[PDB]
């Protein structure tokens, strides 16, 4: 049950090389000379402790390696949308070119269908006037013709022998050269739908402040748009900020704590979103591009500011884009931070990072 | 009234004589009194009689010169409808030649917009098989140390021999410990396509015939060619010019030589001799008639066909009667009469008068 292997002993004692347990027989032989040992009350307790903080460690490096799963399962349906996108795009693009060329068609028949109106229009003119010519000699035989047949040849003849002595009568060019031309080169450039992310649309949003200033409100605040208090004590704000860094800050940080707060401000948002019962269903509705946008109005306003969107939290999720674009207009958030809220809705809209690539 | 008389002569208005005199110099007539009047007081006065004649004969000389001056004009007025059905051809050919090449280019937008979504399917294929791969690469990761971790937590507990045998290597591992990261292609370079920011037989015929060098309509809207040479009677352009090419023996593109229009001329002539000899509703015809009728009964059988012409039987009944007076009159009261009058005109004169009356004007 517990005893050594083959000496039949009791197993006391613990080699430092080996690390495993052994008895004091198994000391004196091949694989224990030179070995430095110790009982095994000598080393555990403190071995006990070793683990304890192993343990801990490779708690929290299964929680990282959790996040780098969802992180790529992240990625693959995001290339979905990406691909899915640029097909429609690819696509629907070479439609209007097909346009272009049924109109530069019937423009260039019409070109011959008046060509077919000006040769047509000589043409019945000049028809009509000798075609009378025709008939009008027959008007002068069939006169003649009846003036023989004397009164009858006579009246008048001499004028006659004078009328008939003066009876005088490619659009096609090498459309596979200019998409040759096209085709070689640019602006190879990164995907323009996953080379940002909530992140990057905050910086641009909030933008990164090291020393406390006051809110769009009046309030004071730091770094990445953290909001610390609404009193109009610096102090206070300072004291909150001491409070949130962990020292002693007096109004003002470095970009490494301003990331911090950060991170934990948009972390701490999206779990405002996760218990929130309004919200979520409209998350994992919507695609990447989107789920930032989320974020962006509940890490302005808080949770409970965006659950009151019902209106356009229903079209968005319906996805009717262009009309929650008009339906967030008519609210109190776009009034007061117009350019903010145009942005996040372009987003809403577009579904694309195009209402910042400008910034 | 009487015959063989001459009509009651009028009287000069102006002084009441008879007028018998013809006025030399002014061309006119009046009585003798009038002769005396200023208005003549030295012009040479004839009778009419003595004049008549003269003038009879100069007006017949003269009338002929007016019938051969009219048909020089009649025939300026196919000059010019020609010419009219000469460009309404080239323009249905120049609409149909452009509408094909602009057809030639939507073929070509459609295999390269193939060609772009035959990448972006690509990409989609190859990014989602590395993705699919190091997300399983992750997966390893997350279970894995789920599993060294309830190593731990199992050693944690129970006996101390268990917690202290071979714990080295965990403490060893653990803290060579490097998670890796999965295969993310978030900023790698990447391309999607940018749209741009836009006489006898022969003779006879081509007078009735004519000669275009190029695809026209026929007296039926059919496309011929040459000298009355049926391609079709489909409507389609392309379907003539087809055909026209299988006939030539090259490809054409709507236009032959005048050597090429004989060509196909006397292919078709030489069949029309055949299409009655073969035929013993025709032969019988064709050999009880004479040269000249022979050729007005092939002009038959090559504007309609021996089935066509055999189904003329009393006009051809009354032909090799040689009823001509009766017979003439059959071949009027038909379609055939009434779609080309002026043809049927020079076919049936032909017929009855046994001579080129009909194109001794044309
Ligand atoms: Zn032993
Ligand atoms: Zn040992
Ligand atoms: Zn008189
Ligand atoms: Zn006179």
């Known amino acids: 049950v517990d005893h050594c292997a083959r000496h039949g002993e009791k197993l006391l004692l613990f080699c430092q090389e080996d690390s495993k347990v052994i008895c004091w027989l198994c000391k004196d032989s091949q694989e224990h000379r030179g070995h430095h040992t110790f009982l095994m009350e000598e080393v555990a307790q403190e071995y006990h402790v070793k683990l304890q903080t192993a343990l801990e460690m490779l708690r929290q490096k299964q929680q990282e390696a959790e996040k780098l799963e969802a992180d790529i399962r992240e990625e693959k349906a995001s290339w979905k949308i990406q691909i899915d996108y640029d097909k429609t795009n690819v696509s629907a693009d070479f439609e209007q070119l097909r346009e272009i060329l049924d109109w530069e068609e019937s423009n260039e ?66 459309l596979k ?59 206070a704000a300072k004291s909150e900020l001491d409070k949130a860094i962990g020292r002693n800050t007096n109004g003002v940080i470095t970009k490494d704590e301003a990331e911090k707060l950060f991170n934990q401000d948009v972390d701490a948002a999206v779990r405002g979103i996760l218990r929130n019962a309004k919200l979520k269903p409209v998350y994992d509705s919507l695609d990447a591009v989107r789920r930032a946008a989320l974020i962006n109005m509940v890490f302005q306003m808080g949770e409970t500011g965006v659950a009151g969107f019902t209106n356009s939290l229903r079209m968005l999720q319906q996805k009717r884009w262009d009309e929650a674009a008009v339906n967030l207009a008519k609210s109190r958030w776009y009034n007061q931070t117009p350019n903010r809220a145009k942005r996040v809705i372009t987003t809403f809209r577009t579904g694309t990072w195009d209402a910042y690539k400008n910034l």
């Not at 009164?151 to 001499?158: E, I, N, P, R, T």
């Not at 996953?194 to 770094?223: C, Q």
């Open 109 to 174: 028949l019409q070109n011959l269908e008046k060509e077919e109106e000006d040769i047509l229009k000589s043409l019945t003119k000049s028809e009509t006037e000798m075609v009378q010519q025709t008939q009008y000699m027959r008007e002068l035989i069939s006169e003649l013709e009846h003036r023989l047949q004397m009164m009858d040849l006579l009246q008048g003849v001499d004028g006659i022998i004078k009328r008939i002595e003066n009876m005088t009568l490619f659009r096609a060019p090498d």
């Open 177 to 235: 050269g200019m998409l040759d031309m096209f085709r070689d080169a640019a602006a190879e450039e990164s995907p323009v739908l996953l080379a940002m992310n909530i992140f990057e649309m905050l910086r641009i949003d909030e933008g990164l402040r090291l020393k406390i200033y006051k809110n769009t409100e009046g309030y004071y605040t730091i770094g990445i748009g953290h909001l610390l208090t609404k009193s109009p004590s610096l102090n």
